[PDB]
Amino acid sequence: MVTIVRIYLDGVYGIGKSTTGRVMASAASGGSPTLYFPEPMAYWRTLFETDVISGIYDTQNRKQQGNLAVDDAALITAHYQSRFTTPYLILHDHTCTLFGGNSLQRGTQPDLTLVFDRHPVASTVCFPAARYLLGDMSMCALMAMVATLPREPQGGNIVVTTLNVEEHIRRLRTRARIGEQIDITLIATLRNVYFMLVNTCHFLRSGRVWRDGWGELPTSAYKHRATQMDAFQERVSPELGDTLFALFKTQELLDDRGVILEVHAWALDALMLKLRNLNVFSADLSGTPRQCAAVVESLLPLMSSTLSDFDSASALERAARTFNAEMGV
Amino acid sequence: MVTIVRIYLDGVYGIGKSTTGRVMASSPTLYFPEPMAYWRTLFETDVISGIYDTQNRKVDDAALITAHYQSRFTTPYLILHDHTCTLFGGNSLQRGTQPDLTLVFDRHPVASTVCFPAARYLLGDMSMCALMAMVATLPREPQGGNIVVTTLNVEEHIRRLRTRARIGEQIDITLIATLRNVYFMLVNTCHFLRSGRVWRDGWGELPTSCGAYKHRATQMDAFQERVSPELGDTLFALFKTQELLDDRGVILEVHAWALDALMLKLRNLNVFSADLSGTPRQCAAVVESLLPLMSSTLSDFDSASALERAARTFNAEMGV
């Protein structure tokens, strides 16, 4: 038998996710034998007749320019948003058959650590949520995305990466073209959405449910605040209004009476059940890559581990080798 | 402990599955209808109008808009699946008795995520990429599921669809023919997995489905139901395409994983067929007759009440 700790590293782009993950996988970094699963980049650019990275931001240009109807521009955007998801769903279907069960917090160092660049939450929930709040996407499209989030089986750990805005923009800046513009509005919205995610999991871990405070909560003004730089944070004890659930109390989902339809309630039930099994953490990436790797590394004692066998652990290693080689550039 | 038999009534449209379902409910029987309101009524867009109106291309951008609409068909199915899968219970077994409760669902997630799209790249209206996209979103069927594919001789099917259209309408006959082939492939896939085999058994010794295979899959009566089918009679066969292989002709591992998922997700689907030639009451009788061959799960009193609540709500919210 083999003890396994699995970690999804997530957050806003340009913070230092991949670099931290690669260092964590290194071996110069010590700790437990670690396997890194990078972003499925080939899948997006190189394996099919289209570059989904192109399309996404490009559609936001064609719509601005007046190159495609705004009704069409919300539709082809959505389809690309959908394509981001596919490789994550596939990786998830594959590896969940191998983690094993017996989730526990065992405190000791595992036989083996897995590190995934991004959890399926990123492309099915967070990124679409951002786009909906900015007005690039409808509620109906968001629900299309959100419904495709898979259930996390027992044992999962998600580490959301944090960083002060100054340094984050500075980090994007160094990596940007000549005098290329940075989308401050998107990052600001994406930064809040990830705080809403961290808050949500805290909420659910404290035994609370999306109905706890629903009647009192105002209708979702809300979208203004969602784009406001630093309007949201990691909260000690989260209230419904600090979580993702709050964006769903809007008119498009309610009665004539003002009561949410039971069918959208079912949708919020599913989002809850699906995030239940994600043990949540924060990691500040202020340091150098080495120091970042250590900030995440020191979260291990509170992390959940599963018991798997030697044959599955090997199957996870071939998976990682297969994934790295098939997803590069 | 309440004994539950859930059946998914599925197949190509315009045969009479909804009608059959409604009659079965009139052993107590619940009927979950299609999420019609969800698709047409609850939001600004009409996905049934949309996917038809998007075919005002009759050729490259349409393929992306029709693929997005396909996603929207799926949404309410994933929502209903997530709510009910909690309540069915475990202990799957073919007990051969009349259950305390039988659930009739209009269609399974497999229709919208696999059959209509999931490599519906077939008519060339959608791409392998857009396909993998839908197929990946197929939910895992928990133990005890039963699927009944409705079959109908093509003459009576075409008649039914015609005696339902108005002054200047069309029937996408070429879509109807393809769907009839894809649903046979679905039946065969389940028989094949039940037979103990796996998508790899026959894979090397299968011709690369490229160009010719798609054209064959759109001909009326090109496929049929077989108890012992060849790999080429299944949904697995359509994924051996140049688009998914490397230089040396071997399927990439990531694509292989997608076939495993599809495989695994279909495992607990006990498949049946039913001929819908007769009257609505006869069709229901045909389906009712398969009951003692089906899987049943053991649920608690509280969960079966929740399922009864589920159907009342769903019929209430999804009408028109």
Curated annotation (Swiss-Prot), chain B:
It catalyses: thymidine + ATP = dTMP + ADP + H(+). Its EC number is 2.7.1.21. The keyword NAD does not apply. Substrate binds at Y52, Q70, F73, F116, R166. This is Thymidine kinase. Belongs to the herpesviridae thymidine kinase family. It comes from Equine herpesvirus 4 (strain 1942) (EHV-4). Homodimer. Transmembrane segments: none annotated. Pfam families: Herpes_TK. SUPFAM superfamilies: P-loop containing nucleoside triphosphate hydrolases. GO terms for biological process: DNA biosynthetic process; TMP biosynthetic process. InterPro entries: Herpes_TK, P-loop_NTPase. Catalyzes the transfer of the gamma-phospho group of ATP to thymidine to generate dTMP in the salvage pathway of pyrimidine synthesis. The dTMP serves as a substrate for DNA polymerase during viral DNA replication. Allows the virus to be reactivated and to grow in non-proliferative cells lacking a high concentration of phosphorylated nucleic acid precursors. The active site is at E34. ATP binds at G11, V12, Y13, G14, I15, G16, K17, S18, R160. GO terms for molecular function: ATP binding; thymidine kinase activity. Keywords: ATP-binding, DNA synthesis, Early protein, Kinase, Nucleotide-binding, Transferase. It is an enzyme of class 2 (transferase).
